[PDB]
Amino acid sequence: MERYENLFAQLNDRREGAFVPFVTLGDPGIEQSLKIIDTLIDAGADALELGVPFSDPLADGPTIQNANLRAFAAGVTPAQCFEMLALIREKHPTIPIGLLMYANLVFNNGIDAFYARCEQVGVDSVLVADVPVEESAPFRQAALRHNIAPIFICPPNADDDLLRQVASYGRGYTYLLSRSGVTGAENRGALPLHHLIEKLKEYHAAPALQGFGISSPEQVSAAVRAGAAGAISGSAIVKIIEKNLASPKQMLAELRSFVSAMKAASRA
Amino acid sequence: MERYENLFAQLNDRREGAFVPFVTLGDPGIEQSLKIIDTLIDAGADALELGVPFSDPLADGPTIQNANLRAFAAGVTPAQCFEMLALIREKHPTIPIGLLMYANLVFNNGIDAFYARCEQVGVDSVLVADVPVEESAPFRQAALRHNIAPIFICPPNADDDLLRQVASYGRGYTYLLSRSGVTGAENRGALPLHHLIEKLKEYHAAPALQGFGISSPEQVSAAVRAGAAGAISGSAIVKIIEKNLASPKQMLAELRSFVSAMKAASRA
Amino acid sequence: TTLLNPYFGEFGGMYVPQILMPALNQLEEAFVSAQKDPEFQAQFADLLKNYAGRPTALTKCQNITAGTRTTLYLKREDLLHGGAHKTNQVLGQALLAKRMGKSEIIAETGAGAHGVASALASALLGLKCRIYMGAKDVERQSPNVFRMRLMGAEVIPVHSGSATLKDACNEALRDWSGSYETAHYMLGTAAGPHPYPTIVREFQRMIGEETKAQILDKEGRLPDAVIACVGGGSNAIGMFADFINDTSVGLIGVEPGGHGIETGEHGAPLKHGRVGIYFGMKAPMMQTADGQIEESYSISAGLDFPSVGPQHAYLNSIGRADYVSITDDEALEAFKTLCRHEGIIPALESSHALAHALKMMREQPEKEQLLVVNLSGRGDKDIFTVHDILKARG
Amino acid sequence: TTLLNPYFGEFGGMYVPQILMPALNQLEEAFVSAQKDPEFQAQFADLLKNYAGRPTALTKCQNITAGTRTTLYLKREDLLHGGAHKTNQVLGQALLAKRMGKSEIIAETGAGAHGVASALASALLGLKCRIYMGAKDVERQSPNVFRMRLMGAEVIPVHSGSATLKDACNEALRDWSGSYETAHYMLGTAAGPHPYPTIVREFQRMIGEETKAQILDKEGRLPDAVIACVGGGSNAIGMFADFINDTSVGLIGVEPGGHGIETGEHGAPLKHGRVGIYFGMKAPMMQTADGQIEESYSISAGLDFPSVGPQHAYLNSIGRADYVSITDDEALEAFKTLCRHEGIIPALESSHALAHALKMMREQPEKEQLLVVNLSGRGDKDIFTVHDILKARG
Ligand SMILES: Cc1ncc(COP(=O)(O)O)c(/C=N/[C@@H](CO)C(=O)O)c1O
Ligand SMILES: Cc1ncc(COP(=O)(O)O)c(/C=N/[C@@H](CO)C(=O)O)c1O
Ligand SMILES: O=P(O)(O)OCCNS(=O)(=O)c1ccc(OC(F)(F)F)cc1
Ligand SMILES: O=P(O)(O)OCCNS(=O)(=O)c1ccc(OC(F)(F)F)cc1
Ligand SMILES: [Cl-]
Ligand SMILES: [Cl-]
Ligand SMILES: [Cl-]
Ligand SMILES: [Cl-]
Ligand SMILES: [Cl-]
Ligand SMILES: [Cl-]
Ligand SMILES: [Cl-]
Ligand SMILES: [Cl-]
Ligand SMILES: [Cl-]
Ligand SMILES: [Cl-]
Ligand SMILES: [Cl-]
Ligand SMILES: [Cl-]
Ligand SMILES: [Cl-]
Ligand SMILES: [Cl-]
Ligand SMILES: [Cl-]
Ligand SMILES: [Cl-]
Ligand SMILES: [Cl-]
Ligand SMILES: [Cl-]
Ligand SMILES: [Cl-]
Ligand SMILES: [Cl-]
Ligand SMILES: [Cl-]
Ligand SMILES: [Cl-]
Ligand SMILES: [Cl-]
Ligand SMILES: [Cl-]
Ligand SMILES: [Cl-]
Ligand SMILES: [Cl-]
Ligand SMILES: [Cs+]
Ligand SMILES: [Cs+]
Ligand SMILES: [Cs+]
Ligand SMILES: [Cs+]
């Protein structure tokens, strides 16, 4: 989790928000995915959120549903994903790497063993999309034993108990959900989140990253202006993959262009 | 009905049974049917039983079902049948002519009017296949008003009341049913009928003609030996029509051969 | 000689070949005996309750009558085992067959509902069942034919005449005229020679009896009218019987008007045919000018009997019951309406009765009236037919 | 924080995205409230009686057990409106939706039976209904899809994942995670996140309650065992619930064995899968070695839920209930047997339970045992499937 603490301290010094892309590991294949991820970093990504392909991603809209399907079409397995993660860390020592998981992949071969593998490959955080704070205990315990930050969702429908729980249990960053629904660039969050941001700070929560429906620079700047430490973008990044399947080189160029613009918008 | 009285008195004098073929009027067409009927007469038929084509002949097996269908295929109507009957009588003054009817054709344009038309064309008897003695009153009354013999069925399942009723109400001949079931040459009557024949004589019934399943000379002789006044044959005659549709001339030759043999068997 | 009057006024009788008279007399005697026999009644009640699922619900349909002064209940014969009212009297007739020591069952069917009911009862009660069905109907009713065969019945296609229900009716009677010593003919409607109109009514009358008890419980009074479709007359007379002596209660029978009465393509002999004598009875018939029997046309397979039971013709004659018709299009609209507003899929036959009730409501929406429609069957079987029509339309 | 325990032992829970937790809490509260509300209970009872046709018969099947010491009754959920037990809890859930002021319904379906039940209830009660169904299932279940649409429901094919039930399950939860303020998710089995396993049991428990009363009336004692097929677990838990505290009464659940357990082509996760976390619960799953969710295979469309309700996993763990499997061929034999010997056409799902009862009888024919099979649905819908198999055979 220490990579997040270091990043946030550095970004505070550069008076910048964090820009954090999401991609699915192995979409559209292992080799291209490794190139995609290196392009995101080179173009200014401050941290990564990385999905392991899962059969039933019930928190994801169609864009990311299709990314998982592409990775399965390429034969991508969790074991291959962990191989990828080891290599990504071997290339990039300081960038925080967070995984987006579904519970069954974590529970499958034992929760503790899952987090031990994350620690072995150099992952910094795990967000389990279908585990609410109410069910989180064995997950957050295993995470902390293995120096992994457990990432909690602060939904816009959050009450005071939830804010206090997420502030207490979370590390790394607090995921500030833009809105109800599922991932997708086609739906923009129509709710002011400043009050949640302030309460989380009051309760000494991990710094907040806003996510869901972030697809434009103005949204990155808006997140920072509201007091968030930064912003996560997934579907917008994955749509560039989907748009450019036929042209790997153009795919990387467009990814670079997009990430560069989005990172530039994080300057306060 | 007087034609039957005269026939039976004459046959008694020639020590002969009556041989009575059935055909469907207008099977397989009007012109051929007229030739068929003239052939039956020329070959030795003592009387005729003639069916008017009806949509739903529920006392008939497949052979006669198909005869009705052929006549309908030829467009034969009851009005055309009555035209035929007038011509047959104009050709043959003494032969008894009995019709085999279903109730709806008799009731359709009024029961009385039906029997008046029968009298006008020179019919001698009417058997309504789906009117039991229990329902017979308006039919037998109309028949007698128009000098038509009402023909009653004496089934093998007859009790004493039935024998007395059929003996009282009937004229012309009493129809002695060989067996249960429907018309057909493929089913031969396996019941001795001598007792019924004797009781009918006791009660002064119209002379009995055995019918249903009569298809061979030995059956004609058997009927006479049991005390019946004669025998009716339908399906066997109609099968010769059906067998020979493609060859009108051969049809008549075979009909002649069959009727000649069957009539010869009526000699006591 | 009979125990009971074979006629309703001028209508009915026993117009069968002489050979079949002992079978009818035997059946009449067995019935009259059975109706006095507590053991018979107990066995019948047991089958109706524990096997068929009686009593059936009486459903109040609030949505369809909103904004009018009509209160409409549906008598739910669609919920009976087999999915139609036919089950009731099949069970009674199967018990009569046993009472008489008969071991075989003959049945006719057009739509197949009576055939399925006959097959199921025969399977339960250990009778060997043969079903006659016009060859045209066999082709149209593959599902029902398969159900009959699964239940161990022999289905015999009939190719004579028009190869439809009347031709099946004939074949059943030809078979019976030769097999009556061992086989019972399980006629499927309140028609045919005495004693069938009487037996079928008495073995369906629990429909009206339950309806009366249910409506008294829920509303504290008798209905203003009870409304039922009329094919041969069994579901209707089963609904009407218990109300005949309640002279305030209207009895409305609905014949199929097909493409419209004026087209001649309908199945409404009671009001638009002509009295004739056929299938063992004197009754209104679909027939040609010459007296040949014709078929009933309807979108609904089960309203195909080309005549009508004699008690209906009688109740009409004396003005005790009134008979109307509903066209294919009216029936289809009622079908769609019930599905969407009440979540019940009605048989297209039954949809004719519902259509007439909707007309009673819509024509006079400020008339206070408490109506019951007999929902004679479920419409699962009709969704292909409806599909194909709505596809050929919108 | 919840009012009720979300777990049965180690099994169950609320494994949904955080965004959905308020919706589950709201639903739990509404349920706990409703169960104490006489008005709610009266409205539910009215719908079950007068609309759905409860109570259902308990049929004694004499022919099928002849020459053995087994007495077998069938609980006739096949006679419920809609033709399956699914109707019971749909009505209760629709009333909860209203209680919460929700105006829209989301439902998943595989075979289509739950979808039809959801559509019918929504039509009756004035809710706007949207049904998710895997694209493969839409193709296989044209009749049910049409029934749903006739009743005014929107049917939405799901093309993601394997395009079957689990994928429909996902889509329902994605929709709900964005619409819960106005829409209720009407889950179709005793599975998913708390409070659904509990709600679905309580809204199906009249099956077992009636069965207990019926068997006491007819036999003067409790059954030796009650037997039900297990897809997701609703009909079984509805039959089992009222007997759980009657420790003499065996509770036997029957999972589909498909082509045989050893083939891997089955739907028997409780006994042959592996515990996982998916569709909001910790429960036995069909899954790959890597933890990807797999489909359940069965000849019967409705035994396709690739996991099992958590209460079943719990009752198994403690040895209160026993779970077995029945192969496609066994189920098909039971189907044919009931048709021919009792005149009842059972759903292929239900045929799995009947097959296991026949095995209990046949293996030990001199064992005195009083058994009840829950006949969860009618098999009208399956006659094409059976036709095609028997055609490809004899
Ligand atoms: C669901 C339903 N409602 C009404 C009727 C109409 O018959 P009644 O007038 O009630 O006797 C029928 C008829 N069916 C017959 C004839 O095809 C048969 O199945 O063989 C029916 O299936
Ligand atoms: C007639 C019948 N019996 C049993 C079951 C099995 O379901 P439980 O275990 O009782 O919950 C089903 C299931 N059908 C679902 C899934 O495809 C559906 O329709 O959507 C069914 O349709
Ligand atoms: O930009 P979008 O709209 O595609 O959103 C990006 C989502 N990628 S993610 O890994 O942060 C992410 C985070 C949380 C998720 O589900 C949960 F909130 F229920 F936990 C799912 C995905
Ligand atoms: O030789 P078969 O077996 O074809 O019998 C010939 C029948 N022709 S018929 O006109 O006498 C004849 C006589 C009686 C009939 O039915 C009834 F007995 F019910 F009245 C039907 C036909
Ligand atoms: Cl792993
Ligand atoms: Cl913290
Ligand atoms: Cl841009
Ligand atoms: Cl005339
Ligand atoms: Cl005389
Ligand atoms: Cl010869
Ligand atoms: Cl009398
Ligand atoms: Cl009279
Ligand atoms: Cl006989
Ligand atoms: Cl009652
Ligand atoms: Cl009373
Ligand atoms: Cl009252
Ligand atoms: Cl008139
Ligand atoms: Cl028709
Ligand atoms: Cl009117
Ligand atoms: Cl009125
Ligand atoms: Cl609790
Ligand atoms: Cl726990
Ligand atoms: Cl919402
Ligand atoms: Cl009860
Ligand atoms: Cl009690
Ligand atoms: Cl007892
Ligand atoms: Cl285990
Ligand atoms: Cl399956
Ligand atoms: Cl066992
Ligand atoms: Cl036992
Ligand atoms: Cs009203
Ligand atoms: Cs009619
Ligand atoms: Cs037994
Ligand atoms: Cs299961």
Side-chain angles (χ1 to χ4, degrees), chain C residues 84-104:
Chain C
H85 72 287
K86 294 299 195 184
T87 298
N88 294 319
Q89 74 99 13
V90 153
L91 289 168
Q93 279 206 58
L95 293 173
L96 286 181
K98 297 171 66 227
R99 181 179 192 91
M100 286 185 295
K102 308 285 177 96
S103 30
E104 295 181 13

PDB file of all heavy atoms in Angstrom, chain C residues 84-104:
ATOM      1  N   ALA C  84     -59.047 -27.720 -19.082  1.00  0.00           N
ATOM      2  CA  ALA C  84     -60.388 -27.385 -19.547  1.00  0.00           C
ATOM      3  C   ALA C  84     -61.432 -28.123 -18.713  1.00  0.00           C
ATOM      4  O   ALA C  84     -61.145 -29.124 -18.060  1.00  0.00           O
ATOM      5  CB  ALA C  84     -60.570 -27.741 -21.004  1.00  0.00           C
ATOM      6  N   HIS C  85     -62.674 -27.627 -18.823  1.00  0.00           N
ATOM      7  CA  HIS C  85     -63.799 -28.197 -18.094  1.00  0.00           C
ATOM      8  C   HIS C  85     -64.102 -29.636 -18.496  1.00  0.00           C
ATOM      9  O   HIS C  85     -64.849 -30.305 -17.784  1.00  0.00           O
ATOM     10  CB  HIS C  85     -65.070 -27.350 -18.358  1.00  0.00           C
ATOM     11  CG  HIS C  85     -65.581 -27.549 -19.747  1.00  0.00           C
ATOM     12  ND1 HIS C  85     -64.929 -27.024 -20.847  1.00  0.00           N
ATOM     13  CD2 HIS C  85     -66.607 -28.288 -20.227  1.00  0.00           C
ATOM     14  CE1 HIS C  85     -65.567 -27.380 -21.940  1.00  0.00           C
ATOM     15  NE2 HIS C  85     -66.574 -28.195 -21.586  1.00  0.00           N
ATOM     16  N   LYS C  86     -63.588 -30.089 -19.656  1.00  0.00           N
ATOM     17  CA  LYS C  86     -63.897 -31.411 -20.185  1.00  0.00           C
ATOM     18  C   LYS C  86     -63.610 -32.526 -19.171  1.00  0.00           C
ATOM     19  O   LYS C  86     -64.296 -33.552 -19.157  1.00  0.00           O
ATOM     20  CB  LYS C  86     -63.038 -31.694 -21.424  1.00  0.00           C
ATOM     21  CG  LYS C  86     -63.333 -30.795 -22.634  1.00  0.00           C
ATOM     22  CD  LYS C  86     -64.738 -30.894 -23.191  1.00  0.00           C
ATOM     23  CE  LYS C  86     -64.894 -30.280 -24.567  1.00  0.00           C
ATOM     24  NZ  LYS C  86     -66.311 -30.308 -25.048  1.00  0.00           N
ATOM     25  N   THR C  87     -62.609 -32.315 -18.311  1.00  0.00           N
ATOM     26  CA  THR C  87     -62.185 -33.285 -17.310  1.00  0.00           C
ATOM     27  C   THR C  87     -63.350 -33.699 -16.406  1.00  0.00           C
ATOM     28  O   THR C  87     -63.429 -34.854 -16.005  1.00  0.00           O
ATOM     29  CB  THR C  87     -60.994 -32.728 -16.523  1.00  0.00           C
ATOM     30  OG1 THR C  87     -59.964 -32.564 -17.506  1.00  0.00           O
ATOM     31  CG2 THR C  87     -60.514 -33.658 -15.425  1.00  0.00           C
ATOM     32  N   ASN C  88     -64.241 -32.757 -16.063  1.00  0.00           N
ATOM     33  CA  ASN C  88     -65.272 -33.058 -15.074  1.00  0.00           C
ATOM     34  C   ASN C  88     -66.078 -34.271 -15.521  1.00  0.00           C
ATOM     35  O   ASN C  88     -66.251 -35.235 -14.760  1.00  0.00           O
ATOM     36  CB  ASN C  88     -66.276 -31.909 -14.867  1.00  0.00           C
ATOM     37  CG  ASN C  88     -65.623 -30.696 -14.248  1.00  0.00           C
ATOM     38  OD1 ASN C  88     -64.801 -30.840 -13.353  1.00  0.00           O
ATOM     39  ND2 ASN C  88     -65.930 -29.530 -14.798  1.00  0.00           N
ATOM     40  N   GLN C  89     -66.647 -34.187 -16.730  1.00  0.00           N
ATOM     41  CA  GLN C  89     -67.641 -35.191 -17.077  1.00  0.00           C
ATOM     42  C   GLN C  89     -66.975 -36.474 -17.586  1.00  0.00           C
ATOM     43  O   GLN C  89     -67.594 -37.542 -17.539  1.00  0.00           O
ATOM     44  CB  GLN C  89     -68.692 -34.591 -18.017  1.00  0.00           C
ATOM     45  CG  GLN C  89     -68.151 -34.402 -19.434  1.00  0.00           C
ATOM     46  CD  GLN C  89     -68.579 -35.530 -20.340  1.00  0.00           C
ATOM     47  OE1 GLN C  89     -69.466 -36.316 -19.982  1.00  0.00           O
ATOM     48  NE2 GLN C  89     -67.997 -35.591 -21.537  1.00  0.00           N
ATOM     49  N   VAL C  90     -65.734 -36.363 -18.081  1.00  0.00           N
ATOM     50  CA  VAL C  90     -64.971 -37.539 -18.455  1.00  0.00           C
ATOM     51  C   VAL C  90     -64.816 -38.466 -17.245  1.00  0.00           C
ATOM     52  O   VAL C  90     -65.006 -39.684 -17.348  1.00  0.00           O
ATOM     53  CB  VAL C  90     -63.634 -37.127 -19.114  1.00  0.00           C
ATOM     54  CG1 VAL C  90     -62.569 -38.180 -18.930  1.00  0.00           C
ATOM     55  CG2 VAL C  90     -63.811 -36.862 -20.606  1.00  0.00           C
ATOM     56  N   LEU C  91     -64.548 -37.883 -16.069  1.00  0.00           N
ATOM     57  CA  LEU C  91     -64.342 -38.690 -14.868  1.00  0.00           C
ATOM     58  C   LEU C  91     -65.637 -39.426 -14.517  1.00  0.00           C
ATOM     59  O   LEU C  91     -65.616 -40.616 -14.226  1.00  0.00           O
ATOM     60  CB  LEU C  91     -63.844 -37.808 -13.715  1.00  0.00           C
ATOM     61  CG  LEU C  91     -62.406 -37.317 -13.908  1.00  0.00           C
ATOM     62  CD1 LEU C  91     -62.072 -36.236 -12.897  1.00  0.00           C
ATOM     63  CD2 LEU C  91     -61.382 -38.459 -13.829  1.00  0.00           C
ATOM     64  N   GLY C  92     -66.768 -38.724 -14.613  1.00  0.00           N
ATOM     65  CA  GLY C  92     -68.061 -39.317 -14.313  1.00  0.00           C
ATOM     66  C   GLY C  92     -68.390 -40.424 -15.312  1.00  0.00           C
ATOM     67  O   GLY C  92     -68.880 -41.476 -14.937  1.00  0.00           O
ATOM     68  N   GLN C  93     -68.151 -40.139 -16.595  1.00  0.00           N
ATOM     69  CA  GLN C  93     -68.459 -41.135 -17.611  1.00  0.00           C
ATOM     70  C   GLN C  93     -67.549 -42.346 -17.468  1.00  0.00           C
ATOM     71  O   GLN C  93     -67.999 -43.463 -17.753  1.00  0.00           O
ATOM     72  CB  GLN C  93     -68.332 -40.574 -19.023  1.00  0.00           C
ATOM     73  CG  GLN C  93     -69.567 -39.778 -19.430  1.00  0.00           C
ATOM     74  CD  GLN C  93     -69.719 -39.774 -20.928  1.00  0.00           C
ATOM     75  OE1 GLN C  93     -69.821 -40.815 -21.567  1.00  0.00           O
ATOM     76  NE2 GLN C  93     -69.786 -38.584 -21.501  1.00  0.00           N
ATOM     77  N   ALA C  94     -66.273 -42.141 -17.108  1.00  0.00           N
ATOM     78  CA  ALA C  94     -65.381 -43.281 -16.918  1.00  0.00           C
ATOM     79  C   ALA C  94     -65.897 -44.145 -15.766  1.00  0.00           C
ATOM     80  O   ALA C  94     -65.833 -45.373 -15.837  1.00  0.00           O
ATOM     81  CB  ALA C  94     -63.954 -42.815 -16.681  1.00  0.00           C
ATOM     82  N   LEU C  95     -66.429 -43.515 -14.707  1.00  0.00           N
ATOM     83  CA  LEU C  95     -66.978 -44.293 -13.608  1.00  0.00           C
ATOM     84  C   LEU C  95     -68.243 -45.025 -14.061  1.00  0.00           C
ATOM     85  O   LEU C  95     -68.532 -46.116 -13.571  1.00  0.00           O
ATOM     86  CB  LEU C  95     -67.253 -43.432 -12.366  1.00  0.00           C
ATOM     87  CG  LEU C  95     -66.039 -42.848 -11.646  1.00  0.00           C
ATOM     88  CD1 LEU C  95     -66.529 -41.895 -10.560  1.00  0.00           C
ATOM     89  CD2 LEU C  95     -65.131 -43.927 -11.042  1.00  0.00           C
ATOM     90  N   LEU C  96     -69.037 -44.440 -14.969  1.00  0.00           N
ATOM     91  CA  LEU C  96     -70.216 -45.162 -15.438  1.00  0.00           C
ATOM     92  C   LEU C  96     -69.778 -46.371 -16.251  1.00  0.00           C
ATOM     93  O   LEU C  96     -70.380 -47.441 -16.180  1.00  0.00           O
ATOM     94  CB  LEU C  96     -71.102 -44.285 -16.338  1.00  0.00           C
ATOM     95  CG  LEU C  96     -71.928 -43.193 -15.669  1.00  0.00           C
ATOM     96  CD1 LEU C  96     -72.745 -42.486 -16.731  1.00  0.00           C
ATOM     97  CD2 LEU C  96     -72.896 -43.769 -14.607  1.00  0.00           C
ATOM     98  N   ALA C  97     -68.757 -46.189 -17.083  1.00  0.00           N
ATOM     99  CA  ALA C  97     -68.230 -47.295 -17.862  1.00  0.00           C
ATOM    100  C   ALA C  97     -67.860 -48.451 -16.928  1.00  0.00           C
ATOM    101  O   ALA C  97     -68.231 -49.597 -17.195  1.00  0.00           O
ATOM    102  CB  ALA C  97     -67.037 -46.838 -18.659  1.00  0.00           C
ATOM    103  N   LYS C  98     -67.158 -48.128 -15.836  1.00  0.00           N
ATOM    104  CA  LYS C  98     -66.799 -49.167 -14.868  1.00  0.00           C
ATOM    105  C   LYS C  98     -68.051 -49.784 -14.231  1.00  0.00           C
ATOM    106  O   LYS C  98     -68.120 -51.000 -14.030  1.00  0.00           O
ATOM    107  CB  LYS C  98     -65.786 -48.626 -13.856  1.00  0.00           C
ATOM    108  CG  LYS C  98     -64.445 -48.213 -14.460  1.00  0.00           C
ATOM    109  CD  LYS C  98     -63.532 -47.488 -13.506  1.00  0.00           C
ATOM    110  CE  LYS C  98     -63.060 -48.366 -12.370  1.00  0.00           C
ATOM    111  NZ  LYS C  98     -63.191 -47.689 -11.050  1.00  0.00           N
ATOM    112  N   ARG C  99     -69.035 -48.948 -13.879  1.00  0.00           N
ATOM    113  CA  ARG C  99     -70.251 -49.401 -13.223  1.00  0.00           C
ATOM    114  C   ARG C  99     -70.936 -50.476 -14.073  1.00  0.00           C
ATOM    115  O   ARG C  99     -71.502 -51.425 -13.526  1.00  0.00           O
ATOM    116  CB  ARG C  99     -71.173 -48.205 -12.973  1.00  0.00           C
ATOM    117  CG  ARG C  99     -72.464 -48.570 -12.260  1.00  0.00           C
ATOM    118  CD  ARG C  99     -73.342 -47.364 -12.006  1.00  0.00           C
ATOM    119  NE  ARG C  99     -74.439 -47.665 -11.094  1.00  0.00           N
ATOM    120  CZ  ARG C  99     -74.346 -47.520  -9.772  1.00  0.00           C
ATOM    121  NH1 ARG C  99     -73.198 -47.138  -9.237  1.00  0.00           N
ATOM    122  NH2 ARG C  99     -75.392 -47.782  -9.002  1.00  0.00           N
ATOM    123  N   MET C 100     -70.836 -50.329 -15.409  1.00  0.00           N
ATOM    124  CA  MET C 100     -71.509 -51.177 -16.389  1.00  0.00           C
ATOM    125  C   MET C 100     -70.638 -52.383 -16.722  1.00  0.00           C
ATOM    126  O   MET C 100     -71.036 -53.255 -17.494  1.00  0.00           O
ATOM    127  CB  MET C 100     -71.781 -50.399 -17.677  1.00  0.00           C
ATOM    128  CG  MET C 100     -72.913 -49.414 -17.505  1.00  0.00           C
ATOM    129  SD  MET C 100     -73.385 -48.572 -19.039  1.00  0.00           S
ATOM    130  CE  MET C 100     -71.903 -47.634 -19.410  1.00  0.00           C
ATOM    131  N   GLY C 101     -69.449 -52.423 -16.125  1.00  0.00           N
ATOM    132  CA  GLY C 101     -68.523 -53.508 -16.394  1.00  0.00           C
ATOM    133  C   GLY C 101     -67.841 -53.376 -17.750  1.00  0.00           C
ATOM    134  O   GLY C 101     -67.298 -54.348 -18.278  1.00  0.00           O
ATOM    135  N   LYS C 102     -67.845 -52.169 -18.322  1.00  0.00           N
ATOM    136  CA  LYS C 102     -67.140 -51.962 -19.577  1.00  0.00           C
ATOM    137  C   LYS C 102     -65.672 -51.697 -19.287  1.00  0.00           C
ATOM    138  O   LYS C 102     -65.352 -51.032 -18.295  1.00  0.00           O
ATOM    139  CB  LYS C 102     -67.667 -50.726 -20.317  1.00  0.00           C
ATOM    140  CG  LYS C 102     -69.173 -50.650 -20.541  1.00  0.00           C
ATOM    141  CD  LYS C 102     -69.701 -51.565 -21.621  1.00  0.00           C
ATOM    142  CE  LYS C 102     -71.209 -51.506 -21.740  1.00  0.00           C
ATOM    143  NZ  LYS C 102     -71.649 -50.572 -22.803  1.00  0.00           N
ATOM    144  N   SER C 103     -64.805 -52.141 -20.212  1.00  0.00           N
ATOM    145  CA  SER C 103     -63.370 -52.130 -19.985  1.00  0.00           C
ATOM    146  C   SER C 103     -62.653 -51.287 -21.038  1.00  0.00           C
ATOM    147  O   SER C 103     -61.443 -51.056 -20.948  1.00  0.00           O
ATOM    148  CB  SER C 103     -62.813 -53.539 -19.906  1.00  0.00           C
ATOM    149  OG  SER C 103     -63.583 -54.431 -20.712  1.00  0.00           O
ATOM    150  N   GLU C 104     -63.421 -50.780 -22.005  1.00  0.00           N
ATOM    151  CA  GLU C 104     -62.853 -50.000 -23.097  1.00  0.00           C
ATOM    152  C   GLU C 104     -63.624 -48.696 -23.269  1.00  0.00           C
ATOM    153  O   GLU C 104     -64.804 -48.665 -22.965  1.00  0.00           O
ATOM    154  CB  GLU C 104     -62.875 -50.819 -24.386  1.00  0.00           C
ATOM    155  CG  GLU C 104     -61.962 -52.020 -24.241  1.00  0.00           C
ATOM    156  CD  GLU C 104     -61.839 -52.951 -25.429  1.00  0.00           C
ATOM    157  OE1 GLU C 104     -62.275 -52.577 -26.518  1.00  0.00           O
ATOM    158  OE2 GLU C 104     -61.281 -54.057 -25.241  1.00  0.00           O
TER     159      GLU C 104
END
